[PDB]
Design an enzyme around this catalytic site. Sequence first.
Site, short mmCIF file in Angstrom:
data_model
loop_
_atom_site.label_atom_id
_atom_site.label_comp_id
_atom_site.label_asym_id
_atom_site.label_seq_id
_atom_site.Cartn_x
_atom_site.Cartn_y
_atom_site.Cartn_z
N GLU A 32 0.86 -1.16 0.00
CA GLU A 32 0.00 0.00 0.00
C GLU A 32 0.91 1.23 0.00
O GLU A 32 1.80 1.34 0.85
CB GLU A 32 -0.90 0.03 1.25
CG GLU A 32 -2.03 1.06 1.19
CD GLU A 32 -1.54 2.50 1.14
OE1 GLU A 32 -0.65 2.82 1.93
OE2 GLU A 32 -2.03 3.32 0.32
N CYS A 58 -5.81 4.74 5.77
CA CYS A 58 -5.57 3.47 5.08
C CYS A 58 -6.84 2.66 4.80
O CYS A 58 -7.61 2.36 5.72
CB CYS A 58 -4.57 2.59 5.85
SG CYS A 58 -3.90 1.22 4.85
N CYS A 76 -5.50 -1.58 5.67
CA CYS A 76 -5.81 -1.73 7.11
C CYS A 76 -6.98 -0.80 7.40
O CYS A 76 -6.88 0.16 8.19
CB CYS A 76 -4.60 -1.47 8.03
SG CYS A 76 -3.90 0.22 8.08
N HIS A 106 -7.76 2.38 12.23
CA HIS A 106 -7.61 3.79 12.62
C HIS A 106 -8.90 4.36 13.21
O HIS A 106 -8.84 5.19 14.13
CB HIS A 106 -7.14 4.64 11.46
CG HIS A 106 -5.75 4.34 11.02
ND1 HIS A 106 -4.64 4.73 11.75
CD2 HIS A 106 -5.28 3.66 9.95
CE1 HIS A 106 -3.55 4.32 11.13
NE2 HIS A 106 -3.91 3.68 10.03
N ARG A 156 -0.21 -4.79 10.94
CA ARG A 156 1.21 -4.44 10.74
C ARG A 156 1.97 -4.08 12.03
O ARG A 156 3.20 -3.88 12.00
CB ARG A 156 1.32 -3.33 9.69
CG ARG A 156 1.02 -3.84 8.29
CD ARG A 156 0.59 -2.75 7.31
NE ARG A 156 0.14 -3.38 6.06
CZ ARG A 156 -1.09 -3.91 5.89
NH1 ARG A 156 -2.00 -3.86 6.86
NH2 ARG A 156 -1.40 -4.51 4.75
N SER A 165 3.81 1.13 10.35
CA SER A 165 4.73 1.33 9.23
C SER A 165 5.67 2.54 9.45
O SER A 165 6.75 2.59 8.85
CB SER A 165 3.99 1.44 7.89
OG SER A 165 3.41 0.22 7.46
N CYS A 191 2.87 -0.14 4.68
CA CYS A 191 1.67 0.65 4.45
C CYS A 191 2.09 2.10 4.54
O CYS A 191 2.31 2.62 5.63
CB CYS A 191 0.56 0.26 5.44
SG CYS A 191 -1.11 0.51 4.83
N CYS A 231 -0.47 4.74 5.80
CA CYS A 231 -0.44 4.57 7.24
C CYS A 231 0.77 5.29 7.86
O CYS A 231 0.62 6.10 8.78
CB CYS A 231 -0.40 3.10 7.59
SG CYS A 231 -1.98 2.28 7.89
N1 FCO Z 1 -1.90 -2.60 9.92
C1 FCO Z 1 -1.86 -1.53 9.51
FE1 FCO Z 1 -1.83 0.24 8.83
C2 FCO Z 1 0.05 0.46 8.96
N2 FCO Z 1 1.19 0.56 9.02
C3 FCO Z 1 -2.14 0.76 10.45
O1 FCO Z 1 -2.32 1.11 11.52
NI NI Z 2 -2.54 0.54 6.36
#
Ligand code: FCO
Ligand code: NI
Lengths: 545, 262
Positions: free
Chosen positions: A21, A68, A71, A75, A472, A495, A539, A542
């Site tokens: 991503e 994101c 994922c 969030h 992640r 990330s 990501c 992210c």
């Molecule tokens: N899993 C995921 Fe996205 C990232 N890095 C988030 O929080």
């Molecule tokens: Ni993500």
Amino acid sequence: KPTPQSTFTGPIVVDPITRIEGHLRIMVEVENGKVKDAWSSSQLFRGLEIILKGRDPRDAQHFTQRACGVCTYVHALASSRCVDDAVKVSIPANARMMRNLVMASQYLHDHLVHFYHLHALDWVDVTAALKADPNKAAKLAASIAPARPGNSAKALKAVQDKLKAFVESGQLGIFTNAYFLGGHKAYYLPPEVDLIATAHYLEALHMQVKAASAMAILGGKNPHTQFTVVGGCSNYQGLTKDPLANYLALSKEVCQFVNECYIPDLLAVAGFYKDWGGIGGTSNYLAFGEFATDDSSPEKHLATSQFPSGVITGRDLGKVDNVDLGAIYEDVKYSWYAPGGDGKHPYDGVTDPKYTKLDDKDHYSWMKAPRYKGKAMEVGPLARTFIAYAKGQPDFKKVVDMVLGKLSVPATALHSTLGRTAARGIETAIVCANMEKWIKEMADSGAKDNTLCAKWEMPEESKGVGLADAPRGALSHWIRIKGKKIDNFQLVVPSTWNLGPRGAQGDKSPVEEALIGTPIADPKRPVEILRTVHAFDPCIACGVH
Amino acid sequence: AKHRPSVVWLHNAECTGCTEAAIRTIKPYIDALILDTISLDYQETIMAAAGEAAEAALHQALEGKDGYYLVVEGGLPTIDGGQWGMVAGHPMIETTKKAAAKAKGIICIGTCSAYGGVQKAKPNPSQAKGVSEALGVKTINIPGCPPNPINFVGAVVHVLTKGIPDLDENGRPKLFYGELVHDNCPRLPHFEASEFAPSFDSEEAKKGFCLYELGCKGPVTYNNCPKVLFNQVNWPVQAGHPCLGCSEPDFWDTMTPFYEQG
Ligand code: FCO
Ligand code: NI
Ligand code: SF4
Ligand code: SF4
Ligand code: F3S
Ligand SMILES: [Mg+2]
């Protein structure tokens, strides 16, 4: 023979890094065929922290979820936990259960898609699958995996025919210029294994639809759920019998595919790439824990997470420390932010974008560099796995040992790209083993009492932190409320931990460190860079937000 | 073998939620679509090639003899000559501009590409713009955050087999966005009877009362959500939560605060 390695000396840049991503640029220095230095350069900034300033704290979860869509949900969850903490509301038991199940659903969907559709093409030569004899492949599958109609010779042949027609058309689509076309020294799989994996790849395209449907029963929709609110959840229907029976049904199906295809494929790949048990290791691991039985506060989350929280340093499994949320900060020295922004705790976070130029080794990423008492921290499935294993968590102990035994490798072999990849499957298997228990917990609770949202009041002035372990890794949202509005809102995302740039000491992040020592069989087609980078499941949206 | 129409897919300022939405398609599934119907010749999220090899794949596709259709995911950050959003060392605005110049048609998947999206919300630090907003090319808009796969795939198939579908003011196909969310909502009887939930913990909420008092933007939002559902199972209001107005231009600023009415 040995791991193939050229004699190439010079720079390599990979941009775009595909099958992640977001927008990543990787730069390495290579000497005599091995990576000697590395840079992880995130290429897009959006600025959600800036955007949130002055807004209604109830709106936060809706903006932050758009950090994101891979994922998705996580969030919105971290923001809800964050705002729940800031207004000091403890959510009802049913809300804790519903929130944690949607997270379990997200792990299942995210991990399956990653292995097959993002990571597998680093290990599986799809065009070599055409060389396979389908009867031999059927016999191989039969012996390495639970018996299943989709593994029959008739089934594998159909896959092969479809693929043959596709390739013979001359329009290779997503396979155009693949690193594996015409063969490649770093790809080890027999054609039969390629075929098996390719058939499952196609199957997984359909199965992820079912995994997302399960998630949507409780989350309202996928991508981007719409069922969380301050004080709990809105989805009363999700506590009722028929939707929960559908949810279990779909989940059982997804988990069947995890146990029949994902894990066996992962173990077969790991078997052939044993040498990758010695490439891409790091030394520090952090988790905030997930799937807690008590989510009334950040404290209680860290303590009661069924996938436990913890901190591991210098590979020492004998010493798992409690997470000191006070010791977390972010640096910007090697980031595209105004200098003098270093060492900020997220409650005091500053997001002051300032671009320089492409490939400026002084400033080379839109990610900040999160550090824990000065130390870079790997987060994600491997982190959770080590912490749980070291802590003696029974499911992890049992699944890890099964893996290490099937592969005949010491547990130390897990500190590597192979281990990072294996840990992702390990925990998917464990989430699957818990789905029925968790679902029954909520079904009963929801049929005895349907309370799903608690009463709460917006304070003039407060602060709060929301913790989650996303697919992640360790995710935290941090809010300052002033005049009942958002005064500061900071995300520190897995990330960001894994793929951020160097810290104020010039110390490499986990991915940059993991890349040191990577062998390069063919500089023209550096699959080995992809294998390590993808194992961290990057990501970028992210990481930067 | 019959030649399949070339589709180039670009990622700009985005969360990849629109790509993820796309691959939840079941009529057909994603595999059938890319094996039988189109030739998807560039897609950063799922393509095998990376770096220079991927870049070459894009440039090959853009130079295709039979031409190509362009799908755009994400908004375009324009601050600092477009440098806050780069792919292969090129500003996203420059690449999208090149690709739009020869496209047979341009489909903007998602509110971000259509209208600017989340990164454009105040105070818009990256100076993000919608595709038509930043370039002045006319676009077929499939908005939502993210759109239903039925709406995106349906639009794609229509464009390849029938022509451009009839569009509203905001460039959205009337096939999918011709109706208010509210006009198709199962809670409409409660709305008509002034039966609203005052809070999410309330008995009124438990009984499935209308969510207008809790900020539902269904009455001002054009989408087909209650009619088609998401993931074949649910939609936000069925899950007890107000509509955010996510298929409307600049909703991040026009529909907020989300739990209030204007
Ligand atoms: N899993 C995921 Fe996205 C990232 N890095 C988030 O929080
Ligand atoms: Ni993500
Ligand atoms: S429209 Fe929404 S889901 Fe699509 S890329 Fe933009 S923020 Fe993500
Ligand atoms: S819940 Fe929303 S869409 Fe449904 S009737 Fe009420 S205002 Fe209209
Ligand atoms: S928020 Fe968006 S998904 Fe549909 S229900 Fe409202 S238009
Ligand atoms: Mg941040």
